[PDB]
C-alpha cells in the first residue's frame, strides 16, 4: 500500500504545479473510499495555517488545486464501517481456533501478520505497533520480521517522521546476522540518507542513498522516479565534477531514465552545464529545475533556496580557479545575470569562511587563491578548543 503513503504526504509539500497536486489529491479521494482509515486522512487536514497553496478552503482564500476538498467528514463512514469492524472480528475469530488447538508455528504468527498489515488499512495507532509485536515474539527469524519492519517503515509517510521510524527499528535492523543480504541493502540505505538530509551531511548518503544497488525501486519505501531524482540532486553537491562522468553516467540506472522519462529535466541541464562549465546556460536552469524537482521534492522542499544559492556560485567558483585575471563586466554580461545581485550573494558568504578567493567590484580585477595554506592548517586546533574541554570539566566535579 505505497500509493496511500505517498499521496497522503506529497500533497502538503507542493505549492506549485496544480497538475502535480491533482495527482496528490484526486488519487486520495478515490482510494480513501476503498480503505478504512478515518484518522490518518484527517491528520493530513490538521496542518493548514501557515502554508502556501493548500488544497482546502477554510481560513484562507487560495485552494489552487483542481481538487478543492481534502476535508474529513462523516460521509466516509458509509463505506468505512462495512469493512472496518467486520473483518477485524472475523480474523480475530480464527485466532480463537489457533491457540486452543495449537496448529503450527506459522498460523499463530501469520494471523497477526494478516492483522498488523490490515491494521494499517484500518488506520489504528497502537494496533499497528503493539499488537503487531505479538507475531514478532512468536517468530524469532529475521525473515518474518520484514513485515514488522515494513509496517514501521511505511510510517515515515504516515506519521511524517524522519527520526522515530528508524529509532524503533534500530534494534530490529541490527540484531546479529547481517551478511550479504540484498533486500536489507535497499531498506537500510534508503532511510539512512533521509535522516542526514536535515543535518545536511550528505557525505554518508553519497555511497548509500545516492548509490542504489537496485535499478528499480523498493515499492513501499520510495518510488522509481524518486530514487533516481535524489541521486542527481545530491550527487552534484557531494561528488565532484570528475566523479560525475565516472559514476552518475557510468551507472546503468541513468541510461534507462534518459530514454524514458525526460520530465526531470536535470539530466540535460544540470549535468551538461556543469560538465561544460558554462555559467550562462546554468543560470536559467536553476528555477526550471527548482520548480519541477525541488518544489515537488518530499524531503528537501523545506530548505531549498539556501541550498540552491550555495551550489549556484560553486559552479562559478570552480571556474574561477581556471582563470587568473578576469574583469567584472567581460563575460558576466553575457551570462544573463546582474552585477548588483551577484555581489550581494557573494558578500554574505564571507563570514561563512567560504571565500578565500579574489573578488572585486568597483575595479573588477578577479583572481583566484590557494585555500590550502598554514592558516586553515592551524584552524583544526582552534575549532577543538571549546569542544574538547566540554566533557573534561563536566564530569570531573564529583568524580575525580
Amino acid at each position: 500500500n505505497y500509493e496511500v503513503s505517498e499521496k497522503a504526504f506529497l500533497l502538503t509539500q507542493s505549492k506549485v504545479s496544480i497538475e502535480q497536486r491533482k495527482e496528490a489529491a484526486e488519487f486520495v479521494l478515490a482510494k480513501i473510499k476503498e480503505e478504512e482509515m478515518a484518522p490518518y486522512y484527517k491528520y493530513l487536514c490538521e496542518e493548514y495555517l501557515v502554508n502556501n497553496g493548500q488544497s482546502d478552503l477554510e481560513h484562507d482564500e487560495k485552494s489552487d488545486s483542481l481538487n478543492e476538498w481534502i476535508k474529513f467528514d462523516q460521509e466516509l463512514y458509509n463505506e468505512l464501517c462495512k469493512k472496518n469492524e467486520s473483518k477485524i472480528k472475523e480474523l480475530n475469530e480464527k485466532i480463537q481456533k489457533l491457540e486452543e488447538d495449537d496448529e503450527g508455528e506459522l498460523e499463530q504468527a501469520q494471523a497477526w501478520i494478516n492483522l498488523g498489515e490490515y491494521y494499517a488499512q484500518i488506520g489504528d495507532k497502537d494496533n499497528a505497533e503493539k499488537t503487531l509485536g505479538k507475531s514478532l515474539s512468536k517468530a524469532i527469524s529475521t525473515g518474518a520480521k520484514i513485515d514488522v519492519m515494513l509496517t514501521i517503515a511505511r510510517l515515515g509517510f504516515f506519521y511524517n517522521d524522519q527520526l522515530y521510524v528508524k529509532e524503533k527499528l534500530e534494534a530490529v535492523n541490527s540484531m546479529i546476522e547481517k551478511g550479504g543480504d540484498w533486500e536489507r541493502r535497499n531498506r537500510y540505505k534508503t532511510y539512512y540518507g533521509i535522516h542526514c538530509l536535515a543535518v545536511r551531511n550528505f557525505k554518508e548518503a553519497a555511497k548509500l542513498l545516492v548509490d542504489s544497488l537496485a535499478t528499480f525501486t523498493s515499492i513501499e519505501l520510495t518510488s522509481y522516479e524518486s530514487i533516481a531524482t535524489y541521486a542527481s540532486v545530491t550527487g552534484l553537491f557531494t561528488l565532484e565534477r570528475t566523479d560525475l562522468k565516472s559514476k552518475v553516467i557510468d551507472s546503468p540506472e541513468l541510461l534507462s531514465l534518459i530514454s524514458t522519462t525526460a520530465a526531470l529535466q536535470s539530466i540535460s541541464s544540470l549535468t551538461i552545464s556543469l560538465y561544460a562549465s558554462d555559467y550562462a546556460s546554468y543560470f536559467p536552469y536553476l528555477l526550471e529545475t527548482y520548480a519541477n524537482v525541488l518544489i515537488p521534492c518530499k524531503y528537501l522542499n523545506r530548505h531549498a533556496d539556501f541550498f540552491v544559492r550555495e551550489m549556484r556560485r560553486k559552479v562559478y567558483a570552480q571556474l574561477l580557479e581556471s582563470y587568473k585575471t578576469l574583469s567584472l563586466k567581460s563575460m558576466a554580461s553575457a551570462f544573463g545575470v546582474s552585477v548588483a545581485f551577484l555581489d550581494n550573494d557573494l558578500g554574505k558568504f564571507i563570514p561563512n569562511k567560504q571565500l578565500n578567493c579574489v573578488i572585486d567590484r568597483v575595479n573588477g580585477i578577479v583572481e583566484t587563491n590557494r585555500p590550502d595554506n598554514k592558516n586553515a592548517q592551524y584552524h583544526l586546533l582552534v575549532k577543538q578548543g571549546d569542544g574538547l574541554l566540554t566533557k573534561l570539566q563536566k564530569y570531573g566535579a564529583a568524580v575525580r
Partner: peptide
C-alpha cells in the same frame, strides 16, 4: 542550523526571472 538556514528570503524566484528579462531586452 544557524540563521542562514532559517532565513529563507524567498528572493531567488523573482531575481532569476528579472535578470533573464533584462539581458534579452538589451539586444
Amino acid at each position: 542550523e544557524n540563521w542562514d538556514d532559517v532565513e529563507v528570503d524567498d528572493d531567488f524566484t523573482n531575481e532569476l526571472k528579472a535578470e533573464l528579462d533584462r539581458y534579452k531586452r538589451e539586444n
